[PDB]
Amino acid sequence: PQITLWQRPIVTIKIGGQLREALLNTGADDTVLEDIDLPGRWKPKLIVGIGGFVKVRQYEQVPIEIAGHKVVGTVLIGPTPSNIIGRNLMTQLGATLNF
Ligand SMILES: [Cl-]
Ligand SMILES: [Cl-]
Ligand SMILES: [Cl-]
Ligand SMILES: [Cl-]
């Protein structure tokens, strides 16, 4: 799609049977979601949060649909004030900023 920026660029995402929303955030390196669960192994990761650091779970090779487009990549699961799609998945989408 072509998404204008008059409002926050929030899109529908889906991971397995979990339909959620998230912000397309070109200021974020990584993708972090609070309200989904994934099975199996993960690696711990620190991200910045208001105490200093927040521990999240890094899951690799996750199939995710973003605004109806399927990609595969890394998803962090843990506390976040909003669900964020970062550049790691936007690069998998072939997303660009255009003006
Ligand atoms: Cl808004
Ligand atoms: Cl959407
Ligand atoms: Cl699922
Ligand atoms: Cl990735």
PDB file of C-alpha atoms and ligand atoms in Angstrom:
ATOM      1  CA  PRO A   1       0.000   0.000   0.000  1.00  0.00           C
ATOM      2  CA  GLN A   2       0.813   3.724   0.028  1.00  0.00           C
ATOM      3  CA  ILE A   3       0.466   5.076   3.559  1.00  0.00           C
ATOM      4  CA  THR A   4       0.228   8.786   4.250  1.00  0.00           C
ATOM      5  CA  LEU A   5       1.477  10.228   7.535  1.00  0.00           C
ATOM      6  CA  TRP A   6      -1.344  12.651   8.613  1.00  0.00           C
ATOM      7  CA  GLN A   7      -2.061  10.108  11.336  1.00  0.00           C
ATOM      8  CA  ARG A   8       0.070   7.478  13.063  1.00  0.00           C
ATOM      9  CA  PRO A   9       0.794   4.679  10.525  1.00  0.00           C
ATOM     10  CA  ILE A  10      -0.889   1.842  12.364  1.00  0.00           C
ATOM     11  CA  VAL A  11      -1.526  -1.308  10.347  1.00  0.00           C
ATOM     12  CA  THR A  12      -3.073  -4.713  10.932  1.00  0.00           C
ATOM     13  CA  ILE A  13      -0.612  -7.514  11.538  1.00  0.00           C
ATOM     14  CA  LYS A  14      -1.139 -11.244  11.929  1.00  0.00           C
ATOM     15  CA  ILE A  15       1.082 -13.935  13.437  1.00  0.00           C
ATOM     16  CA  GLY A  16      -0.526 -17.359  13.108  1.00  0.00           C
ATOM     17  CA  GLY A  17      -4.043 -16.938  14.470  1.00  0.00           C
ATOM     18  CA  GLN A  18      -3.177 -13.729  16.327  1.00  0.00           C
ATOM     19  CA  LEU A  19      -4.555 -10.598  14.610  1.00  0.00           C
ATOM     20  CA  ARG A  20      -3.123  -7.411  16.153  1.00  0.00           C
ATOM     21  CA  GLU A  21      -2.137  -3.836  15.188  1.00  0.00           C
ATOM     22  CA  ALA A  22       1.255  -2.127  15.192  1.00  0.00           C
ATOM     23  CA  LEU A  23       2.928   1.171  14.285  1.00  0.00           C
ATOM     24  CA  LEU A  24       5.216   1.312  11.214  1.00  0.00           C
ATOM     25  CA  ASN A  25       8.170   3.042  12.917  1.00  0.00           C
ATOM     26  CA  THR A  26      11.131   4.069  10.746  1.00  0.00           C
ATOM     27  CA  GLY A  27      12.812   5.299  13.940  1.00  0.00           C
ATOM     28  CA  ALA A  28      12.977   1.749  15.374  1.00  0.00           C
ATOM     29  CA  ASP A  29      15.604  -0.763  14.388  1.00  0.00           C
ATOM     30  CA  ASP A  30      13.637  -3.774  15.593  1.00  0.00           C
ATOM     31  CA  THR A  31      10.072  -5.048  15.951  1.00  0.00           C
ATOM     32  CA  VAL A  32       8.573  -5.441  19.434  1.00  0.00           C
ATOM     33  CA  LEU A  33       5.097  -6.748  20.213  1.00  0.00           C
ATOM     34  CA  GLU A  34       3.475  -7.129  23.633  1.00  0.00           C
ATOM     35  CA  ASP A  35       0.256  -9.014  22.919  1.00  0.00           C
ATOM     36  CA  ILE A  36       1.318 -12.184  21.127  1.00  0.00           C
ATOM     37  CA  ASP A  37       2.691 -15.539  22.137  1.00  0.00           C
ATOM     38  CA  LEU A  38       4.994 -17.889  20.176  1.00  0.00           C
ATOM     39  CA  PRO A  39       6.002 -21.483  20.910  1.00  0.00           C
ATOM     40  CA  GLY A  40       9.518 -22.818  21.263  1.00  0.00           C
ATOM     41  CA  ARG A  41      12.952 -21.470  21.872  1.00  0.00           C
ATOM     42  CA  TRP A  42      13.989 -17.825  22.045  1.00  0.00           C
ATOM     43  CA  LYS A  43      16.990 -15.746  23.074  1.00  0.00           C
ATOM     44  CA  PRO A  44      16.922 -13.078  25.732  1.00  0.00           C
ATOM     45  CA  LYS A  45      17.527  -9.486  24.621  1.00  0.00           C
ATOM     46  CA  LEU A  46      17.710  -6.155  26.418  1.00  0.00           C
ATOM     47  CA  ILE A  47      15.950  -3.119  25.008  1.00  0.00           C
ATOM     48  CA  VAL A  48      15.642   0.335  26.521  1.00  0.00           C
ATOM     49  CA  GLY A  49      12.627   0.895  28.798  1.00  0.00           C
ATOM     50  CA  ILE A  50      11.835   3.454  31.575  1.00  0.00           C
ATOM     51  CA  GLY A  51      13.799   1.550  34.380  1.00  0.00           C
ATOM     52  CA  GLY A  52      16.942   1.392  32.215  1.00  0.00           C
ATOM     53  CA  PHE A  53      16.455  -1.847  30.427  1.00  0.00           C
ATOM     54  CA  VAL A  54      13.612  -4.271  29.709  1.00  0.00           C
ATOM     55  CA  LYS A  55      14.149  -7.962  29.020  1.00  0.00           C
ATOM     56  CA  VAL A  56      12.309  -9.268  25.954  1.00  0.00           C
ATOM     57  CA  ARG A  57      12.265 -12.559  24.041  1.00  0.00           C
ATOM     58  CA  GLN A  58      13.864 -12.680  20.588  1.00  0.00           C
ATOM     59  CA  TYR A  59      12.149 -15.133  18.244  1.00  0.00           C
ATOM     60  CA  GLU A  60      13.761 -15.772  14.844  1.00  0.00           C
ATOM     61  CA  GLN A  61      12.266 -16.716  11.470  1.00  0.00           C
ATOM     62  CA  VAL A  62       8.736 -15.675  12.460  1.00  0.00           C
ATOM     63  CA  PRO A  63       6.159 -15.635   9.617  1.00  0.00           C
ATOM     64  CA  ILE A  64       4.180 -12.369   9.958  1.00  0.00           C
ATOM     65  CA  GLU A  65       1.664 -10.612   7.753  1.00  0.00           C
ATOM     66  CA  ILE A  66       1.856  -6.817   7.757  1.00  0.00           C
ATOM     67  CA  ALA A  67      -1.015  -4.928   6.056  1.00  0.00           C
ATOM     68  CA  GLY A  68      -1.666  -8.146   4.096  1.00  0.00           C
ATOM     69  CA  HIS A  69       1.975  -8.707   3.030  1.00  0.00           C
ATOM     70  CA  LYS A  70       3.792 -11.878   4.248  1.00  0.00           C
ATOM     71  CA  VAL A  71       7.378 -11.642   5.439  1.00  0.00           C
ATOM     72  CA  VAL A  72       9.645 -13.700   7.698  1.00  0.00           C
ATOM     73  CA  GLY A  73      11.955 -12.190  10.281  1.00  0.00           C
ATOM     74  CA  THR A  74      12.854 -11.493  13.850  1.00  0.00           C
ATOM     75  CA  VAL A  75      10.188 -10.481  16.372  1.00  0.00           C
ATOM     76  CA  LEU A  76      10.825  -9.326  19.955  1.00  0.00           C
ATOM     77  CA  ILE A  77       8.072 -10.173  22.449  1.00  0.00           C
ATOM     78  CA  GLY A  78       7.850  -8.332  25.710  1.00  0.00           C
ATOM     79  CA  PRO A  79       6.749  -5.124  27.388  1.00  0.00           C
ATOM     80  CA  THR A  80       6.455  -2.097  25.034  1.00  0.00           C
ATOM     81  CA  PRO A  81       4.189   0.915  25.302  1.00  0.00           C
ATOM     82  CA  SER A  82       2.912   0.252  21.793  1.00  0.00           C
ATOM     83  CA  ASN A  83       3.410  -2.534  19.264  1.00  0.00           C
ATOM     84  CA  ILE A  84       6.164  -1.446  16.870  1.00  0.00           C
ATOM     85  CA  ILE A  85       7.159  -2.694  13.394  1.00  0.00           C
ATOM     86  CA  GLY A  86      10.748  -1.617  12.923  1.00  0.00           C
ATOM     87  CA  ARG A  87      13.133  -1.398  10.041  1.00  0.00           C
ATOM     88  CA  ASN A  88      14.129  -5.081  10.249  1.00  0.00           C
ATOM     89  CA  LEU A  89      10.662  -6.086   8.942  1.00  0.00           C
ATOM     90  CA  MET A  90      10.139  -3.033   6.771  1.00  0.00           C
ATOM     91  CA  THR A  91      13.283  -4.051   4.840  1.00  0.00           C
ATOM     92  CA  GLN A  92      11.757  -7.523   4.354  1.00  0.00           C
ATOM     93  CA  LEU A  93       8.629  -5.787   2.968  1.00  0.00           C
ATOM     94  CA  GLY A  94      10.735  -3.724   0.539  1.00  0.00           C
ATOM     95  CA  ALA A  95       9.257  -0.623   2.172  1.00  0.00           C
ATOM     96  CA  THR A  96      10.534   2.834   1.294  1.00  0.00           C
ATOM     97  CA  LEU A  97       9.868   6.410   2.315  1.00  0.00           C
ATOM     98  CA  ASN A  98       8.980   8.480  -0.758  1.00  0.00           C
ATOM     99  CA  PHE A  99       8.599  12.220  -1.369  1.00  0.00           C
TER     100      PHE A  99
HETATM  101 CL    CL B   1      -3.260   9.510  14.989  1.00  0.00          CL
HETATM  102 CL    CL B   2      -3.594  -2.539   7.456  1.00  0.00          CL
HETATM  103 CL    CL B   3      -0.626 -18.807  16.483  1.00  0.00          CL
HETATM  104 CL    CL B   4      14.659  -9.678  10.638  1.00  0.00          CL
END
